[PDB]
Every structure is written in structure tokens, then in C-alpha cells.
């Protein structure tokens with residue numbers, strides 16, 4: 726059974742024993758060296774089209790919480806930039822720290838942010854998410870950094886429901902949530918080929934990491950940190966530090982959409 730996690734006994738340094746691609750050639754996350762990233766005029770405009778996004782449910786899966794979408798039609802899609810074709814939004818989730826000084830997966834000139842949002846999309850040419858993750862261009866994940874400062878009003882409905890999904894396996898109805906409230910003003914980004922950042926660590930992702938962070942309040946991220954990795958009735962293990970550290974860049978280039 727799956728027994729990977731974020732603890733000393735089952736965390737990222739152990740994953741390779743059950744998921745040997747952990748030591749692969751295109752693993753994520755990575756440190757983004759902003760001086761070495763090169764502007765690419767070939768990149769087409771990024772198109773985030775969430776007007777018809779249809780959220781359904783929020784789930785504590787024991788690793789993070791996912792806000793799930795109806796992906797049975799092209800209701801919410803990502804296109805353009807480095808992408809060929811249409812990628813459909815399936816879910817978003819976050820990674821975050823025990824303290825404001827850590828929590829992000831990607832880093833920017835080695836800087837760690839308090840958290841990182843991942844909007845996960847699958848390439849419609851593969852029909853379903855399960856098939857998409859077996860393809861090198863199966864997924865596009867839009868990553869957005871969170872820093873602690875002013876509150877993000879568009880996040881508060883998420884924070885408000887966390888009380889109801891404290892433990893692993895709990896879910897709650899979560900309809901009519903607009904993910905556009907989680908974006909920064911600018912769509913300026915970095916992009917590179919990588920992987921899922923949790924087991925199974927599949928090398929199927931085109932990463933698109935926005936340069937501009939969003940600000941959330943200390944009180945908002947403190948509520949993330951009250952979640953539990955454990956199930957109901959088990960010893961409490963706060964859901965904190967659910968991030969994988971930066972992995973070797975190997976033979977990759979990070980491209981910038983700007984400057």
C-alpha cells in the first residue's frame with residue numbers, strides 16, 4: 726500500500742525506494758535561477774479560461790487538500806504559452822510550511838515562499854487524466870507562490886471549509902468556487918518540463934510558474950496548518966511541510982515569458 730509522506734521516516738529522501746523515477750532526468754520541483762532563465766520570444770500568449778469553471782468538492786487526501794472540478798467538458802482550460810493544444814482543469818491544491826519562511830516547492834533564486842498553489846490540468850488529446858499521466862506532455866500545472874501579507878479575499882471560502890475536512894479522507898461539497906480569485910495580476914511566467922512533485926512522480930508535466938506571488942494573510946495560512954495528515958481518531962499530526970525540496974535540473978532549460 727502507499728505509505729509515503731513528509732515525515733522523517735517516509736518523506737522525500739525515502740520516495741525513490743518505491744518510486745525509482747524520483748532520481749529521474751526531469752523531476753520537480755526545481756530552483757528557478759532567474760538570471761539563467763532565458764526569455765523566449767517563441768512562447769505564445771498564455772490563456773487561462775476559467776469563466777465556466779465548475780467546482781464540486783474539497784477533499785483532504787492525507788497529503789494536501791484538493792478542490793475538485795467537473796472536467797467532463799471543456800469548462801476551464803489552459804492554453805497558449807508553451808502548450809500545444811487544450812488542457813482541462815481537474816483540481817487545485819497547495820503545499821505549505823510549518824512557518825512562513827518555508828512551504829513552497831519551487832524556489833526563486835533559492836527563496837522559499839510560505840506556500841505554493843498548483844492548478845492541475847490534463848491534455849484533452851489523451852481523453853482522461855489517467856491516460857494523460859502516462860504521456861510526456863500529459864499535464865500542465867500552473868504554479869503560484871503565496872507570501873504572507875494582506876489577505877486574499879478569493880481564498881477565504883477555501884479557508885472557511887477546512888474546519889470540515891480536518892482529517893484524511895474527509896470531503897465536503899464545494900460548489901460555485903471561482904479559482905480566478907487565486908491568481909495574481911500578471912501572467913508573466915517561467916516554464917520547464919518536469920514531473921509530479923508527489924509519488925508516483927511521473928514525468929508528465931509542463932510546469933508554468935507565475936513570477937508574481939499572491940499575498941495571503943497570516944491568519945489564512947495558519948488555518949492551513951490546522952489540517953491533519955492523519956485520519957479521524959488517530960494521533961494528531963499537523964499537515965505542515967507537505968513540500969518536496971528542489972531537485973537537480975539535469976539537462977533542462979527554464980524559459981521566461983517576459984523581459
Ligand SMILES: CC(=O)NCCc1ccc(S(N)(=O)=O)cc1
Nearest residue numbers: 728729734735739740741742743
Ligand atoms: C508510515 C511510515 O513511516 N512507513 C515507513 C515505511 C515506508 C517508508 C517510505 C516509503 S516510500 N518509498 O513509499 O516513500 C514506504 C514505506
Ligand SMILES: CC(=O)NCCc1ccc(S(N)(=O)=O)cc1
Nearest residue numbers: 843845858866920921922923925
Ligand atoms: C493517479 C495519479 O497519478 N495522481 C497524481 C495526482 C497528482 C497531481 C498533481 C501533483 S503536483 N503537486 O505535481 O501538482 C501531484 C500528484
Ligand SMILES: [Cl-]
Nearest residue numbers: 858859860927
Ligand atoms: Cl508518464
Ligand SMILES: [Zn+2]
Nearest residue numbers: 818820843922
Ligand atoms: Zn502540488
